[PDB]
Amino acid sequence: PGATLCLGHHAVPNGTLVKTITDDQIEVTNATELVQSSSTGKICNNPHRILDGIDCTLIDALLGDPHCDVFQNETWDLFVERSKAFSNCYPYDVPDYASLRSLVASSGTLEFITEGFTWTGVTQNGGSNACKRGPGSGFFSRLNWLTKSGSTYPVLNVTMPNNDNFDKLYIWGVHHPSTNQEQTSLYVQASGRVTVSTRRSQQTIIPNIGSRPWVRLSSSRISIYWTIVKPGDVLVINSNGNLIAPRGYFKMRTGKSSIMRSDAPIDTCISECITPNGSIPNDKPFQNVNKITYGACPKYVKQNTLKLATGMRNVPEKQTR
């Protein structure tokens, strides 16, 4: 009278299908998901400093659209631009909008230092009913509309050296009147010009007289430009008309700041990774939520699921039915 000893392995009633070298589907005892495919719908307010733009684009906040004055001197790790946002100041354009938006978004700050520019022989602080500020007409907070004094617009020629140890960002512009009457009425000279220069670079913009579409009470436009001035360099502004002058400079930082377009509400929670769909967990290596991400995120992939086998081959006993 002997004895038998059988070796074997476990199995489970509910197995999981996985992919391998040789099989597109094959059953295992357990697997785990490597693609994060869902979000809370909400952007967690920690650990990143989230700044909700609300009614404002970063650019309108930069310039100082009156309804965006609450963003003066603000800072962020992630500026969040909403689809509901609108401009409500003088109508403007930014040649290379994308780049100004990017470089500011990256800088992570709207810190503005006012400087004492001396505009000899011109009227300052021009305004418009396009850009109301309280009951009366107004203008962008960080720009200074210059028009004639008496009946003359002299050659403006001013300097502002950088004796700090940080880069200065100057934001300035040029006014494009709709009619020749307007050009001369505001600036005397029939053709203006704005030349903004440092030691290394220069920008010269000729204004262009012509109607544009009527937008917030005006067929005119202001074009926006920027000049960065390095430590030890100098800024020169030379204009005989149409200058929209800076009031100072924005401070520039470098770091982890960015910008995102999203209508997800901001909530109280902690999530390292942010998408426009909302925050997502980062325990998995991959994600299918959105290619746009910010922070410590899983890598975006096209697959909505990838199962990593965490168990042997599942072999249930030979079924009689």
Partner 1 sequence: GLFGAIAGFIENGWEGMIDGWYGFRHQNSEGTGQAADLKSTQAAIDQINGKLNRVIEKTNEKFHQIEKEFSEVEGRIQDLEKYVEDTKIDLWSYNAELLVALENQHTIDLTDSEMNKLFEKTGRQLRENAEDMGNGCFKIYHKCDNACIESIRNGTYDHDVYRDEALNNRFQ
Ligand X SMILES: CC(=O)N[C@@H]1[C@@H](O)[C@H](O[C@@H]2O[C@H](CO)[C@H](O)[C@H](O[C@]3(C(=O)O)C[C@H](O)[C@@H](NC(C)=O)[C@H]([C@H](O)[C@H](O)CO)O3)[C@H]2O)[C@@H](CO)O[C@H]1O
Ligand Y SMILES: *[C@@H]1O[C@H](CO)[C@@H](O)[C@H](O)[C@H]1NC(C)=O
Ligand Z SMILES: *[C@@H]1O[C@H](CO)[C@@H](O[C@@H]2O[C@H](CO)[C@@H](O)[C@H](O)[C@H]2NC(C)=O)[C@H](O)[C@H]1NC(C)=O
Ligand U SMILES: *[C@@H]1O[C@H](CO)[C@@H](O[C@@H]2O[C@H](CO)[C@@H](O[C@@H]3O[C@H](CO)[C@@H](O)[C@H](O)[C@@H]3O)[C@H](O)[C@H]2NC(C)=O)[C@H](O)[C@H]1NC(C)=O
Q: Which residues bind ligand U (CB under 6 A)?
A: 157, 159, 234, 236
Q: Name the binder of 113 from ligand Z, ligand X, partner 1, none, CB < 5-8 A by kind.
A: ligand Z
**Is residue 193 classed as helix, strand or coil in its secondary structure?**
strand
Q: Which of residues 182-211 bind partner 1 (CB under 8 A)?
A: none
Q: Where does this chain touch ligand X (CB under 6 A) — which range of 178-186, 199-207, 280-288, 294-302?
A: 178-186
What CA–CA distance (Å, rounded) separates 279 from 138?
39
- Does 129 interact with ligand X (rule: CB under 6 A)? yes
Tell me 287's DSSP state.
E
Residue 290 CB, shortest distance to partner 1, in Å, is 9
For residues 178 and 2, give the distance between their C-alpha atoms in angstroms, rounded to a whole number: 109
Q: Any idea what DSSP says for residue 298?
A: P
Of 84-123, binders to ligand Z (CB under 6 A) are 111-113
Of 18 and 68, nearer to partner 1 (C-beta) is 18
Say which entry of ligand U, ligand X, partner 1, none residue 216 contacts (CB below 5 to 8 A, set by partner kind).
none
Distance CA 156, CA 309 (A): 73
Residue among 11, 17, 26, 30 that touches ligand Y (CB under 6 A): 30
Distance CA 95, CA 98 (A): 9
Residue 152 partner contact from ligand U, ligand Y, ligand Z, none using kind-dependent CB cut-offs of 5 to 8 Å: none
Q: What is the CA radius of gyration of the chain?
A: 30
110 closest CA partner among 88, 131, 144, 140: 140
> What distance in Å separates the CA atoms of residue 86 and residue 311, rounded to the nearest whole number?
55
147 sits near ligand X (criterion: CB under 6 A): yes
Is 305 a binder of ligand Y (CB under 6 A)? no
Among 93, 310, 312, 313, binds ligand Y (CB under 6 A): 310
Query: Among residues 118 and 319, whose Cβ is nearest to ligand Z?
Result: 118
Q: Does 37 bind ligand Y (CB under 6 A)?
A: no
Question: Among ligand Y, partner 1, ligand U, none, what does residue 159 contact (CB within 5–8 Å per kind)?
Answer: ligand U
CA distance 275 to 297: 9
The span from the CA of 87 to the CA of 218, in Å, is 14
Least gap, CB of 118 to ligand U (angstroms): 10
DSSP per position, 92-159:
EE-TTHHHHHHHHHHHTB--EEE-----TTEEEEE-EEEEEETTEEE--TTEEEEEEBTTB---EEEE
Judged by CB under 6 A, the number of residues near ligand Z is 12
Is residue 72 involved in binding ligand Z (CB under 6 A)?
Answer: yes
Give the distance, in angstroms, between the CA of residue 267 and the centroid of all CA atoms in the same chain.
Answer: 21
Contacts with ligand X by CB under 6 A lie at: 126-130, 137, 145, 147, 177-179, 182, 186, 217-218, 220
Residues near partner 1 (CB under 8 A): 1-13, 18-22, 26, 28, 32, 34-35, 77, 98, 102, 105-106, 256-259, 261, 272, 282-286, 291-303, 306-318
